[PDB]
Structures are given as C-alpha cells and as structure tokens.
C-alpha cells in the first residue's frame, strides 16, 4: 500500500471524472473505461501495425494509400510511419471541413483588443490559405522549401502555416517575442526563401516592433528573397524595402480563392521548430507529416475528448509546439472550432479568459500552470463574474502542476464539476506522452498518470543504464519504441540528434526527464536532469 | 403567339432539321430530340454533380480521380471542379488515339500554298510532340511556367500548345497578326521563360515578319530565356541570337519520339489568352473542366462522331481556334483541319475546295468571312462538291436572318443544320446553341442555353431577373460552370470586377439578350458599360456628358476603379468650381451619381480612359498633367 | 535434315542435356516445367505481348501508380515505350520492399580487393546508407531530370551511389574507374553532371590506384560539376579535396537520417546513362528507361539463371560496364537475393580468388566472361582442386565467344559436370539477355547461345539484299524484328545518332552489329560483329578513339587502328603509325613505347594497343583516304588475299605495310 521511493504517491486518493462531464458531454464517449483503454494501449504496443493502420486511414484522408504502417528502431534513428503514403496537411485542416461544412466556424479569433475580434469559418479559411499560397507559388516557393513566420497569435499565423504546407513547403514559425539575432539564426539555419512577418503587434495594450525586428535581422539572411506584411496596425511610417516587401492584402487581392493542395509524402518534412538545447546554438526540430499529424487528432480526441460539437480554446501560442499541435493542428484536423487569442491573460483585465470561455461557450481550455500562478494570485475574484458552465474538460502543460495548482484549478475554474488533464510531452514528441484520458482515467493530483497510445513509457537507473523493472521505481524517463509524431531529425544535423535522444541509452529514446512509477502504474514527472 | 417585346421572333417559323442530315449522319444521334435535351439539361442545373461527374468520366482520361464534382461560388470567384483530380490535355487529345489508331488522321493541314498541305496522323502529332516537349523540358521548362506561341495557323502552333501542356505548363499563344508591342506586353505580364515562333510567315501570297517583330519585342523581354524557331521559309537571312535562339528542325532531331506526359491538377493552369479595349488581361483556363467543356459542346452542339472531319475556319490566337480548331476536336479523336491562309488564296473557292479535298462534315466559320465571300465569291461555291457536309457552325458576332439564310442556302444547299454559337473567351465553350439535328433554328437565335448553363435575363438598372418569356435584358449565368474561366492572370480584383461584381449572384457576360415565348434567346449586342457604386449603376458616358454641358468645362473624362467599401468608385478629371460640377452632375442625372471627386486637370489622354484608370488607383507629355492633380 | 550446309559449328554436336544434379541442388520446382513450356510462352510474348508482359510486370515489380499501356511504338519510329502512365522506383524495388520484408537478409556481399576488408551489408543496412546518400544528393539540388556521375571501383560504394541517384529520380552515369581523365571528362560534359561520386584511391591486386587524382584532373574542365561526394576508401591524408567543391562521404551522410522517400517516376523516365563505344570516335551515352529495364533485368536473372528466394549470385563483372549493371546490381537486388560485389581481381592473392569467394559464400550462381576463363585455365586450373564447389548449378559466360574447348572446360573444371551452363548473348543497348539457354530448361549446344529469350523476336538479314531469311541452317546479319522492355530508348541528346544507328540500317529491325548463324534446330550461333567494333578482354573500344590519342601525339602524321584475333584478350588492337620525320631503328621501341602510354593517358590503361606498327606511309583510295581492309587483312597473316591493289593511289605502300607488321608485330 506504502510507497518507499514515490513519495509523492503516499496517501493519494483517486480523483473519479465528476458526473457534469459526462452531462455536458454530447456524444458517448471514445472509450468507456480504464480497462477499454488499456486494452488498446496493450494493442498500441505490442501490435502498432493492427492499431495504427486503421486510426491513420480513420481520421486522416489520404492522396495515395501508404503501404507499410511502421520502419526503422530508434537506435539507427530512422524511424517511418504510413511508408509510401501520401497527403496534404492544409487539405486535412482545411478543404475537407470546408466542402462538408463551409459555415462552421475555424478560427475564433480574439485579438487582444476585443473590438478587432472576428471569427473565420472553415470556407473563409479555405479561400485565405489558397490567396496566400497562391501569392507563395507565384514567388516560386515550392516542396522542398522552407518559409519563416514571424507574427503573433492570430489569424495570420495559422493562415500562414496553412497557405505554406499547402504548397508542400515546410514552415518554420519563429515566436514573435524574439530578438534580430534570435530571427537571424533560425532563417540561416533552415535557409528560408521567404518570411511572413507584419507590421506591429498589439500585446496587453502595448505596440510591439515586429517588421523592425525582421528588418533588423535579415541584412544578414541573403537566401530571404521575399517578405509578406500583414498591416496589422497599419502604421504608415513601417518601412517596406523596395523589391523584397510587399503587403499581404495587396498581394492576396490578386489571386483566385482556391489553389490546388499538393501532395506530399508520409515522411516530407512538415516543419521545423527551433528549440534551445543543453549544448550549443537553436536546433530545428523537424516533424513529418502523416506521423505527427495522426499523433495530433489521435491525442486530440483520446486525451481531451473532443466530438465535433465540440469548441478548444488552448492558451498557447505557435511560437510554441503547444500552439502547433493543440492551437492548429489537433483542432483542425478533427473540423471543430479553435480560439485564438493575441492578448494576455491579464489584458483589459484578468477575467480575460473567462471572459472568452463565456463568450464562444468554449467546451475545453489548455494553459500553462504558469498563467494558473498568475490568476490565482492576481485575478481570483474574477473567475466568478463569468459563465464557465460550458467547459468539461481542463487541461495543463509545459512544467509539473503543484497539488496546490491542481486543487485550484479544479475548484475554482472548474467549479469541482471537470476533468483535469496534466499532459506530459516536449517538442520532440509532436504530441501528448503521459497524459490522463479525459473522462476515462482517474486524477492524481501532480501525476500526468498512464503514457498514451504507441508510448512504451520505461524507467532506466542512470548509474548502469538498466531499465528498472517494477513499480514504486525512479529513474531517468526513456521509451522503448518511437511513435507516429516522433520528431525524425535536427535539420541537417542528424548526428545532434542522435547524441541527444539515441545515443545516452541505445535502444531508447530519452527524455531528458527524470521520473517515478507508482504501484498502480501512474508516472510523476520530476523535471529536467 | 405575338410578342410585344422580342420583336425579332414575330413571324418565325421554326426551321426543323432537314432529312439530308440524319442521312449523312454516321451513327444514332447524341440525343434524340428536343424533350430529352431539357431533361438532361434541367438535370445539368439542378444536379450538377450527378449530371457531370459521369461525363467527365466517360469523355476524360484520369491519372488520379477527381472527389469532390464542383465547389465554390461566383460570389467569391472561387470555382473549382473535379477536385483533387490529375489528368494530361496532352495525353486526352493525343496519346490515347494514337495507341487506339495510330494512323488515323490528327491534323489537316492546308498551307498558304497547297502545295505546302500535308497530314500529320495521332501517331505523327504525339512523336511530334514528344519532341518538342523534350526540347522545352532540356531547357527546363516545367510546371508552373509559362511559354509564349507567337505561329501562324499551322502544324507547329498546334505541336507547340500540346508540348507545352505536355509538361504541366501553361501555353500563351499570341496572333500571330500582332504587333511588336502586343507581343512585349503578353509576353511580360505572363513571364514567359520561353517563346516557339518561326522565321516568317505566309499569308495571301505574302511574307510576313514573324522572327523580326519577336526580336523587337524580345529586347525588352527579359524572362524569356530561350526562343525556338522553326523554318517555315528557309530564308537564309532571318538571324538568330547566339545562346538564345534555337532551330525546331535541330532541336527536335535530338529527342524520341516519346515523353511521358505530366499529371496536372484540375485546377492548375492549361493557359492564358489575352484579350484585345483598354489593356490586355489574360484569361486563364483551368485544365479539367475546360477540357471537358471543350468535348461536351463539340459532341452535342455540333453532333460529332468517330468517323467526322471538322474544319473550323478560325485562329489558335483566339478562342476559336483553342475550343474548336484544337481541343475539342483532338479530345474525341477525330480530325481537324488547320488551314494557314485567307478564304481569298490562291483564289475565293479555296474554303469549299478544302472542305471538298477532304469530305469535311462540319463547318464553323465566322459572319465576317461569310460576308466577304457573298460580296466576292459567291459563285465558287457551287463549283465544288458539299454534300459531306450535315453541320454549319456560325460564331462570334450576330448572324443576321439574310446572312443565316444565304449560308444555309448557298453552302448548306437547304440541306444542312446551323448552329448559331453564342459564347465568349472567358466561357471557354459554348453558352447557347441550337445542338444540331435536335433544337430547331429560329434564324437569328442562338436558341436554347448549353449543359451547365443557367441564363437569365437581368434588369439593368436593378439587378433583379426578370421573370416570364417575352422579355429584354442583360444575359446573365446564375451559377458557374465547368469551363469558365478561373481568373485574369495574377488580376484577380480585375476579373472580380468584371464578371462577379456588377451583378452580385451573377455572371456578367456584358451582352443584352431577348427571350421568346418558347424560350428561346436572342442575342441583342453589347451593354453600356455601367459602374456599380453602393448598388447603384451609373453611366460614365452620361456624367461626361452632364460634365460637359458646364460651358466652362472644356474636357471631361469619367472613369471607374476599384473600391473596398462601395465596390466602385468613379473619378472625374476636367474649390468652387468642383463642387459646381458635383452638383451639376447630381441635378442632371441623380443624386447618387455624382462622382466621389472631381479633379481638374489641364491635361487628358488620347494620342485614351485607361490612363486615368490606372492613375486614380496610385501627345504623350498630356499623361504629365493628369498625374499631377491627381496628386494635388 | 541432320547436316547443315551452312551452319558448319552444327554438325556432329550433340545435345548436352541438363544434369540431374542440378536439379538435386535447385531449391525448389523450377519457374518452367520443361522445353515445351517455354516455347509456348515464348511463342505469347511474341504474338501478344500485352498479356504476356502486363502480368510479369504486375508480379515481379512494385508499382506507385499502375500502367494503362503495356506497349507502344515501332523501332522504325524509334519511339518505343512500355508500361506507360505507370510509376515507380528503383531503389525501392532493390532494397525497400526487401528490407521490410526481411531487413536481416544479406544483400550486398562485399568481397575487397584484401580479404581482410570484406564485409556484407544487409538489405536494410543498404537502406540506411542509400537514403543517407539520397538525402546529401538531395540537400545539394539534385532532383528529377539530374545527371550525377560515379568514377567508382566496384564495392559497396558504387551500389549504394546508383541506388542513391535513382532514389531521388535521377539519372546516374557511372564511369569505370580503369578510365583515364579525359574519358571522365567527356562523359561528364556529354552529360551535364551537376554532381559526382568518387573515393580518394582505389586498390587492386594490392596496388594503390589514383582515382580523386584523375577526377580533379578532368574536373578543372567540367564547369557543370558543382559537388563532388568522396568516400575515404583508403583515408590517405595526402588527398586535396578542393574548397567549396568536395566533401566527405562519411561527414556528410552523418548529417542526415536513415531513411528518405524514395521519389516516383515515370516507367519512361531515364534510369541511367551508360556511355558506349562505336564506329565513331565520341563515346554516345546510351540510355535506360525505369520499368523496361527493371523488368527485363528481373525477367532474366530468374528465367535464365533460374534464381530463387534462396540462392545467392556471383557475377564477376563491374559495375563500370552493362554486365556489372544489369547482372550484378539490378537483376539480384530486384529479387531479392545477395548479390557478391568483388572489388579486387581474379589473381590476388592468387588465381583461386573466384573459388575461394564461391565456397566462403556457398554461392549458386556464377557468372564470368570467357576471357577470365582462358586466364584460369591457363594460370590456375590446379587451384581448383582447393576449393568446394558444390554449392553452384548455373554457370554462365557473358561478352564475347566461348569455344566448344572452353565450354568444355569450364563445364568439367568448375561444375563437375554437374552444372548447367548459360552462354548469354546481349549487349549494352539491349539492357538485358537476348539469347540464352534457359538454367535447367534448354539443352545446350557448346558454343550456342541457343533460343531467343521472352519478347525476343530474332532474324537473319542477307547482307546482299536486306530482306530477312525464312528457314534454318542459314547466316547473315542478326536483328530483332520488334522492340522489347528492356531496350535502349535514346542516345543522350543525340537521337539522331541512335536511329542512324540501330533502327535506319535495316528499317524495322533492330541492327545488332553483329552476324550470327542459325541451324536446324533452331539454335543461334554467334559469329561476331559486322561493324568493326573492337572488344578488347570484354571491353568495347573505339578504333577511331584510338586513333584520335594517337594523332594528338604530334610526332604523328597519321594513324590507323584495327582489331585481331587474340587467344588471350580475343580481340587485340593493332596500331599503325607513320611519322613526319622519324628513322632511326634505335629509337623505335621506344617511340613506340611512348604512343602505346599516350593511348594509355587518353583513354585509359585497357585501350592501349596490342602492338604499334611504324610504317612509312598508310595505304589510300584515290580521293586519299585510309584503306583499313588490307591493314585488317594483313594483321591477320592474309596478305594472300589481299588482291588487285592497283585502285589504290599509293600501291607501292602495301608492301613495306606487310615487312613492317612482319618485323615489328613480335618485337
Ligand atoms: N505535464 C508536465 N509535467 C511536468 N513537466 C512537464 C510537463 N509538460 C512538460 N514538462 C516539461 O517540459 C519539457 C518540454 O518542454 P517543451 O517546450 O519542449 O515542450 C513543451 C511541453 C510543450 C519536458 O521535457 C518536461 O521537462
Ligand atoms: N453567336 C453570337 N451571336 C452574337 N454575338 C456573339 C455571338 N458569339 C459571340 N458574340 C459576341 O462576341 C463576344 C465574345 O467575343 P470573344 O472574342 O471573347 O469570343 C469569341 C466568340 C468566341 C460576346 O460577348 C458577344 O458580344
Ligand atoms: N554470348 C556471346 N557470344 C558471342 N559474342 C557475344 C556474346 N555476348 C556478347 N557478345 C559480343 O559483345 C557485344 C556486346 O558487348 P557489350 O560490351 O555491349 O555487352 C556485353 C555483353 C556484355 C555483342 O554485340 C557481341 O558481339
Ligand atoms: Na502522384
Ligand atoms: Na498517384
């Protein structure tokens, strides 16, 4: 019953799913029990062909059958999923939706003045994209390339991301707080043709420098041939340089509200995302296409519970891999309605969110336990002014949530009536690694609980590299196999890649976390080693 | 049974097919008479993709399947179809013939000169062009690129459209006719990497400067980096510039006789025809839903089977000549005659001789022609044998009932169906036409509107359709169809403005049109050109005119452009004194037709209104002045 | 009837029927039930192709996107196609499928020039490398529509080079690493090559050879060659890699994973360039098409060698050459098998090289030119007897005759009599076997090629008339009546060159350059070219290359060159040289010495003559140009026969020609 080693698990009681879940959800839901999900989970591992196969051909619409589920082993690092297949990711986000709903909203975009706020359906999203891919395809870009981003959370980033995979081009989003030398080093790295900026930003009220900065930046970027700005304040005194710049509604104004997707392979790179190591400069963090977007929806809908009805408003930013697959991607894939919100948590006031949770009657909210810390000390009473009835499900990532975060949480943003999900994952692993099912597996607070589909979660001691058999166990956070959103590559540097998740513990793939196993088999993340 | 406003249509009597028709037919007809044609054409409009898909299945060659049949609106300029489908115009007109039969005949082609007359069979056009796609892809020509044909009517214009199309690339073809500006101005405004041409031409006896005019427009043309040139006089003194100029017969004597064709999209580009009044735009086609609309109106419109000969009388530099000199016919593998001269060389016999040489069924010709060989050679006709003939077509420009009558009874001898074709560049086919040996004529009418096609008749001033026959106004489509045109290339504002925006829901084709108690549609020429500002429709001709009469005023020019909040904006060039002018305007047209500003200028275009177009959207010195006070 | 008035190698030869062994080692039923099955499936692709080719090319290779047209074209034409609108890849029906598959499953097995470098590749170690490679080519522009060119010795590197090119959709145009600098570069601009793979030196028979050296060299010459990829073969630091130009195999393809989608293309997309000598002076780069090729490679390889699942194939060739392509690379990794690819030669450390390698590797299949087998014969039958070679049961001979003695041989000597032996006739423009008897099926006639192979359709040609002969036991020209998958489609921008070549000699037949004989039975035997193409120890020469390197020595005036029997390399090279101010017999072995070693530096050490003949003047026709028939006449100790003379302008030549070949030829 006692716990030697999971301290953290001693006198722990399960936390079941409330019963206003499961009233407020509008379907039955994905899987009925813990034992239905272990049951798959078992599958998952010892068979990824038989589980796989029919997911990726269920939520994923295919250009061309692929023809071998699963290659490679992670100690040659080379690793491949849906093998000869091939499909657009903008098609699967975008066109498909549009063609059986052209009205249902896509974007719901709060800016971070309420008044700019507007919200784009999946037919208005369509005719954008193909505008902006089809500027993109006239200035030459192509499959193969790589386009930066650099703009704030809104409608344009993820219209950007889309408009460049539609192509077949690989989008490369640099986070839109980055300094000249920040942006330098991402463009050379990945040798991008052309970048995607706007003018200004708004951020809580404040005017923020962006062209400035990208100006400032690409006097040293020479493969840079063309920039597109966004008049985002429109500010007549922002320099465009004559023969690079060129305005982002001047340019869509002259192309056709449809443009072909192309296709692309399973394996093509889907984007780069530069991330900070522990050893030298940024490095690209490359992801497929069909692996990590079968990743996305599968734990999309598994771990959050989302049905179409449904409406996700996760606090991130694509600056982020959170934004990536959570803000985009997830949402998107499965045709529901996402929020995307260019302000602060704190901006005109601090019932911000929950002013937005009422408004859109957002069904699922995804936040950082930092912007928890934040309104519990700052904007408590504010939670109860607003309307949050709609929500079902909560969730939390990017660092361990305390108890006391936890606790707080669940009362006062989920009135002790929803589901909490603390998702365990990092950009390499393109989506959730350990994660709590909503509505299936049972709370422990400060515990992402049971790894998810595909994810042979292990414990290796760090003095003799053996895996560590047996619960009530600590150790080094490693997994035995790869998975559909593992991310294949540094870009044009596989060697940095290999020395950083391959090569500690060959045969494994580490995380670079420690962690505990308790006896019921929940995982507590203990941080970076 | 009387109209009171289709004048036109009292007193017709419906002209049924004559027997001679279905005697020289080859086959059963397409369709066997008038009530099977609205049943399948009201199933075309209320079920388009039920109706379409099948048809684009049986007449189209597929290298991936299309999944979605039809998408978009014209309100959002956004047409589509056959999503997701790949397909070659190249292979669909010329490969899968030639594997079928490979010595059927493809091309006849009739020279300048007779002598100069030969046939290329499907087998001779796909090694032809495979050859010339090799040459074009060894110079890197691919994809998304586009290259210019500035040929006469021959042989090697219609190899060089199909190499092109063969590579996934968009063709631009030039008349060949055109001046060294016209050519510079297409060439730019497409980027073409590449130009086919020749050394000279031949037209009426004369040679003409084909090369010299390209290398005029070419000093100013800096996207084309390679120009092939076939030898069509051999005339040793026509230069060509080292590293950029290349000859056909050299180049093509390097490459097989066979290339694979490239898998294009439905949606990507097949090509960009710029039209000829202000400047020229280029009308861009899509590849699969042209195609199709190409073989559907040859087949039903003009009833066309396996064993026919058509002799359209047109020119690749214009639509015609795409629809149904190439497309068209190559797409059901019959033949087509490509003829490179005049109706009036060596003599005024010379059409009806071809048609006789080669036992040609079908006949597509313009008024204009007809014309001019009623009032110089009528009495050649009867010199030669047309009894091969069943079909006359008739397109372009209005066909008077005399005129309709003297084709009939001078080349059809009483015997043959007309077809009245209406339709224009940017419909890529047929809009309304009486389908030969099925729709009986009214002479003068083009009939009944095509598969697809959902005309209506709008009221100019507020844009409502006005219901019931016996009626007048501006033609208009209610939905998109498969081979309208998708864009103006890299303009799509210009083409929103043109053809979705005037009549919002609608496609403006820029004619008025009558209809008849039978529903049948005639053609009345084009509308005044009215700008729509907030919904209402002003005249620039009038507010110039109101303008004027201020005895003051000594120019007026009135122009429109575009507008994000009012969708037009019209600008008057001619403190007081302007608002006298609004004022004027108000008082003499309404008060929603004065212009949002009136700028006085002491200098106006003419050498003009497209000048002052483009100055309002941000004697040549006059072009100055405009400018300025624009500026003020 | 049972005599032959014509086909005198006929007469008197007795069938030699299949041993019964071969059949105990054949692993399982054979792929044709007998003779009868054979003709009556040759007899289908002859009359209809169409259904027999489309299902062959439905089983035996993967395809991306299906065909809609098995055939299309006539040689008259020059346009043939097969499998039209398919899609597929090379590299993934050499090694993917195999490595999912089976990914432990030997495919290469690298024997190096030491022993002690051997090595075997697995067929997903092989993937791992060739989508390594294909990622660098990718990384550095190379796409579809490519040329990339490899100067390779043959192992493991040259494999995954070709693999690697045709992985992304290129075309690879490999360069046998015996060829000199020029040969390099006259390939490489032919082609436009924007990129080659090559390695710091070579070794062979334990000497070190100078293969980054010749390529810097013709490189200084090829401004369309922006990269060169060099394996560190022997990791000597004295190798200059040139700035900005050159990189290192192993540094580079650390930087990229394991795995790379393979690119599809069309069945007619060009597979390889293989540039090729004749009657010309510029080598013409011959082309493969994608799925022909494949099909006929994998057609072959199990039809006539009668290759299964289990066996494992030796084909004692180079990469560098049609056989090495076909035979070592494509026909085995299409099916599956390993494949062993000898770097070094058949006399290091010693003549039983070829049989120590057989019995290491238990291989089943060997496959070796009849030059090699003369040489053994000669210098190393008593190392047979060390070796156990039991595990073999087809035996072939590829590139040139085999006599009745050295079939003989080879049957007795390396199979026991208990193999059954394949003597293939084809060449580097049919991509595949033409004529072949059938492992297990055809019985042989030593010295026959036997029956025309699937989709061969064979002819006799009267060299008089140019009308085809009807009936056996006649001669003439041998052609093919009608193209086949595996046909050359092109010479690289150069079709001009290919029709005057191959489809206009003999309109609607495909011209072989070579005379061939046919008897009563039905069995082809080859008499040899008819063009005067020159094949030196299986390499095809250029007499007017030879030529041409001699003249560039500008103490030449003029030069002829012909080929002779040889009983070593079965053709010999013969140059006769007449100087502008030479004498003096002192000088004149090493003058001759010294135009033998420019030939050598020109083209490269296996083009250099046989012997150099310094003569005072060549004999002419009256308009002044070179008779090479009585030089081919006296080479060969016929001056009888040489006849009336008194057309000739210089008559008075012929004479001192016969003493000079007379004195020197030995000397
Ligand atoms: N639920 C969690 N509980 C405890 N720790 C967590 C949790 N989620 C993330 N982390 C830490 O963040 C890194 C990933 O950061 P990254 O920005 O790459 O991806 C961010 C996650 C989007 C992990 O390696 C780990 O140390
Ligand atoms: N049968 C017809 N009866 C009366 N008028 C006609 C007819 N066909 C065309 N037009 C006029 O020509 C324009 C199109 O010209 P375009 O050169 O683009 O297309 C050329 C015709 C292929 C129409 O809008 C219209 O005004
Ligand atoms: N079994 C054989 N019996 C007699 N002669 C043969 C045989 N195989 C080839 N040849 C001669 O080689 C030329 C082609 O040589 P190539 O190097 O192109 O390809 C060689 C095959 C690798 C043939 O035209 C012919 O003259
Ligand atoms: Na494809
Ligand atoms: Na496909």
């Given at each position: 019953q006692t716990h030697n080693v999971v301290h953290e698990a001693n006198g722990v009681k399960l936390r079941e799913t409330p019963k206003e879940f499961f009233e407020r959800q509008p379907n039955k839901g994905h899987i009925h029990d813990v034992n239905q999900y272990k049951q798959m989970y078992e599958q998952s591992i010892k068979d990824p062909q038989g589980f796989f196969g029919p997911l990726a051909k269920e939520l994923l619409s295919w250009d061309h059958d692929f023809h071998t589920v699963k290659s490679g082993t992670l100690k040659n690092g080379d690793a491949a999923w849906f093998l000869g297949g091939e499909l657009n990711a903008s098609y699967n986000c975008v066109?498909?939706?549009?063609?059986?709903?052209?009205?249902?909203?896509?974007?719901?975009?709060?800016?971070?003045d309420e008044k700019d706020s507007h919200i784009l359906t999946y037919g208005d999203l369509l005719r954008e994209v193909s505008k902006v891919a089809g500027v993109l395809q006239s200035?030459?870009?192509?499959?193969?390339?790589?386009?930066?981003?650099?703009?704030?959370?809104?409608?344009?980033?993820?219209?950007?991301m889309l408009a460049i995979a539609r192509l077949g081009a690989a989008h490369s989003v640099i986070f839109a707080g980055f300094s000249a030398g920040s942006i330098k080093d991402r463009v050379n790295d990945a040798s991008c043709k052309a970048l995607i900026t706007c003018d200004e930003g708004?951020?809580?009220?404040r005017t923020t420098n962006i062209k400035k900065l990208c100006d400032e930046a690409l006097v040293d970027c020479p493969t840079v041939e063309k920039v597109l700005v966004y008049k985002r304040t429109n500010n007549p005194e922002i320099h465009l340089t004559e023969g690079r710049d060129y305005?982002?509604?001047?340019?869509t104004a002259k192309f056709?509200?449809?443009?072909?997707?192309?296709?692309?392979?399973?394996?093509?790179?889907?984007?780069?995302?530069?991330?900070s190591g522990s050893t030298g400069t940024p490095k690209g963090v490359v992801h497929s296409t069909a692996g990590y977007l079968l990743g996305a929806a599968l734990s999309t809908k598994?771990?959050?519970?989302?049905?179409?009805?449904?409406?996700?408003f996760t606090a991130g930013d694509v600056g982020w891999i959170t934004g990536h697959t959570y803000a985009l991607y997830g949402p998107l894939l499965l045709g529901v309605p996402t929020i995307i919100f260019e302000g602060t948590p704190a901006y005109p006031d601090?019932?911000?969110?929950?002013?937005i949770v009422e408004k859109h009657k957002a069904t699922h909210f995804y936040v950082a336990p930092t912007a928890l810390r934040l309104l519990r000390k700052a904007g408590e009473q504010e939670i109860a002014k607003y309307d949050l009835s709609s929500l079902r499900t909560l969730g939390s990532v990017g660092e361990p949530i305390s108890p006391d975060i936890w606790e707080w949480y669940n009362e006062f943003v989920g009135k002790n009536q929803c589901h909490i999900s603390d998702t365990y994952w990092q950009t390499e692993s393109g989506s959730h690694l350990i994660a709590p099912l909503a509505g299936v597996v049972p709370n422990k607070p400060g515990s992402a609980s049971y790894p998810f589909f595909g994810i042979d979660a292990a414990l290796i001691d760090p003095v003799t590299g053996v895996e560590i058999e047996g619960n009530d166990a600590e150790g080094v956070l490693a997994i035995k196999d790869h998975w559909?959103?593992?991310?294949?590559?540094?870009?044009?540097?596989?060697?940095?890649?290999?020395?950083?998740?391959?090569?500690?513990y060959p045969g494994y793939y580490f995380t670079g976390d420690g962690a505990a196993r308790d006896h019921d088999g929940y995982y507590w993340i203990r941080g970076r080693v």
């Open positions: 066109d498909r939706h549009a063609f059986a709903n052209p009205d249902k909203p896509a974007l719901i975009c709060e800016a971070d200035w030459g870009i192509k499959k193969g390339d790589t386009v930066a981003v650099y703009l704030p959370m809104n409608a344009q980033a993820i219209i950007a708004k951020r809580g009220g305005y982002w509604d001047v340019e056709p509200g449809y443009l072909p997707p192309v296709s692309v392979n399973s394996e093509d790179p889907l984007f780069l995302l530069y991330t598994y771990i959050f519970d989302i049905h179409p009805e449904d409406i996700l601090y019932g911000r969110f929950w002013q559909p959103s593992m991310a294949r590559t540094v870009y044009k540097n596989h060697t940095k890649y290999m020395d950083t998740y391959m090569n500690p």
